[PDB]
Write an enzyme that holds these catalytic residues in place. Structure first.
Site, PDB file in Angstrom:
ATOM      1  CG  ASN B   8      44.444  14.869  46.424  1.00  0.00           C
ATOM      2  OD1 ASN B   8      44.426  15.681  47.347  1.00  0.00           O
ATOM      3  ND2 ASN B   8      43.611  13.844  46.361  1.00  0.00           N
ATOM      4  CE  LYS B  10      45.149  11.009  48.112  1.00  0.00           C
ATOM      5  NZ  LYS B  10      45.043   9.515  48.197  1.00  0.00           N
ATOM      6  CG  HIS B  92      39.731  11.912  46.054  1.00  0.00           C
ATOM      7  ND1 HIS B  92      40.173  11.000  46.988  1.00  0.00           N
ATOM      8  CD2 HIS B  92      40.748  12.070  45.179  1.00  0.00           C
ATOM      9  CE1 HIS B  92      41.406  10.635  46.699  1.00  0.00           C
ATOM     10  NE2 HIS B  92      41.782  11.270  45.608  1.00  0.00           N
ATOM     11  CD  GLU B  94      41.788   9.756  50.096  1.00  0.00           C
ATOM     12  OE1 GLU B  94      41.916  10.970  50.400  1.00  0.00           O
ATOM     13  OE2 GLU B  94      42.713   9.086  49.612  1.00  0.00           O
ATOM     14  CD  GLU B 162      39.961   8.933  42.917  1.00  0.00           C
ATOM     15  OE1 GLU B 162      38.750   8.962  43.217  1.00  0.00           O
ATOM     16  OE2 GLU B 162      40.825   9.451  43.662  1.00  0.00           O
ATOM     17  N   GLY B 168      45.554  -0.699  48.353  1.00  0.00           N
ATOM     18  CA  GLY B 168      45.825  -1.508  49.537  1.00  0.00           C
ATOM     19  C   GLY B 168      45.084  -2.823  49.622  1.00  0.00           C
ATOM     20  CB  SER B 208      49.952   3.621  42.204  1.00  0.00           C
ATOM     21  OG  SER B 208      51.337   3.697  42.462  1.00  0.00           O
TER      22      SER B 208
END
EC number: 5.3.1.1
Lengths: 246, 245
Positions: B8, B10, B92, B94, B162, B168, B208
């Site tokens: 991906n 992005k 996804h 996002e 995911e 983060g 990750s």
């Protein structure tokens, strides 16, 4: 001192072969000197359209994001738009605002980044039916214009498109005097809040319904500087709309 | 189950930089037991498909739920097919958590994409607040159910887990924690679809993954590949393609 501006928003329509045919029609059509023509293809065909379109017609993206690169699956940046040879982006379109929930804040950020990157911006505004019938047309479109204005440091690459959303897919229609009415107040907002130079030089185009039969009367309104055309941009009568001043 | 590696990209790259990445991938000997897919920015689906060798497939990063319409800024599965792409990424993290895509919309996209002949890489997973409140299973099984309600033919679907809770936040996922969720997801398929669908459906890890970590993740018995993030823009993507070799 205001060049006539006709933008064609293809929205989410077409494939390579069908858009090739559309582009064939546009290329053979004779664009006037006094008319600035812009086509906004689906995002998958920005590149395709730019390679096939005669350079007398500029290409626009239908949307973009607010940073140059990032973890934003599904987005494209102004940098990517320029890289494909496109010179404009449509921002704040009614469908982005009202189907995909894009805020005034976000639309503003997107404007700042697009302009900073060297793109032109067709910044869209408009009130819905419930806002119009509540008698707050002016508050809505001024607030929207304000947020755009807050992110514009140079107006020479901006075009304002008023979308009478209240008259779109709703069984209600906008008369040319109602278009002129709003366009005049928007130019007056620019005069009062930005400057007289920006008010005089900024194109305010009309996003509502337009046909080959109403385009001349709409174009001749003194505060109407051209069009952002939806469905009709996919048909031969886009050429009539390009020649609405002739 | 054929090993599946998705890259991906992005919102990254331009023709220059992606051209060289594509050169790098074109030179790579893809293993015969491994399926590779690249998801470029939407402006570059067409560009990437022309430059990429046919051994690598191409995926759109998102799509909408009808063939054509008044949806400025959207693309359809028809357009994706028209550019030569054979996959679409849907749901996804996002799209869900930055652009507000609901389970309702994602499921509808899945149904339209599949009806139109695309493969779907369908993305699920829980945020930190959900994991810490103890509802990992509820969240991911519900997201999987909406996907499955809109799937008739699982041969065209890859599930991507995911761990959004690891993004983060100050927490990270171990391969054991990845395996746990995958084994749970596969059991959900066994119980709610069929053993055959459970046995043959690639469940890929969308957290990750790097050159350094891909071998141990790949060896987890219920981990069938990766939906790769930043590593997909670099030569080390090739190491991740080589994870089972």
């Amino acid at each position: 001192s205001r060049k006539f501006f006709v933008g064609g928003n293809w929205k989410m329509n077409g494939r390579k072969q069908s858009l090739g045919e559309l582009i064939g029609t546009l290329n053979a059509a004779k664009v006037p000197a006094d008319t600035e023509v812009v086509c906004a293809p689906p995002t998958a065909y920005i590149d395709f359209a730019r390679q096939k379109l005669d350079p007398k017609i500029a290409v626009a993206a239908q949307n973009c994001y607010k940073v140059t690169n990032g973890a934003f699956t599904g987005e494209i940046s102004p940098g990517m738009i320029k890289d494909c040879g496109a010179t404009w982006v449509v921002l704040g379109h009614s469908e982005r605002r009202h189907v995909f929930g894009e805020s005034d804040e976000l639309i503003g950020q997107k404007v700042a980044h697009a302009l900073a990157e060297g793109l032109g911006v067709i910044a869209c505004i408009g009130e819905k039916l419930d806002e119009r019938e509540a008698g707050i047309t002016e508050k809505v479109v001024f607030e929207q214009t304000k947020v755009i204005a807050d992110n514009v440091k140079d107006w020479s690459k901006v075009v304002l498109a008023y979308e009478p959303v209240w008259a779109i897919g709703t069984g209600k229609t906008a008369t040319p005097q109602q278009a002129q009415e709003v366009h005049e107040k928007l130019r007056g907002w620019l005069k009062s809040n930005v400057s007289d130079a920006v008010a005089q030089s900024t194109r305010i185009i009309y996003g509502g319904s337009v046909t080959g039969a109403t385009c001349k009367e709409l174009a001749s309104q003194p505060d109407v500087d051209g069009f952002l055309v939806g469905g009709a941009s996919l048909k031969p009568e886009f050429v009539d709309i390009i020649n609405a001043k002739q």
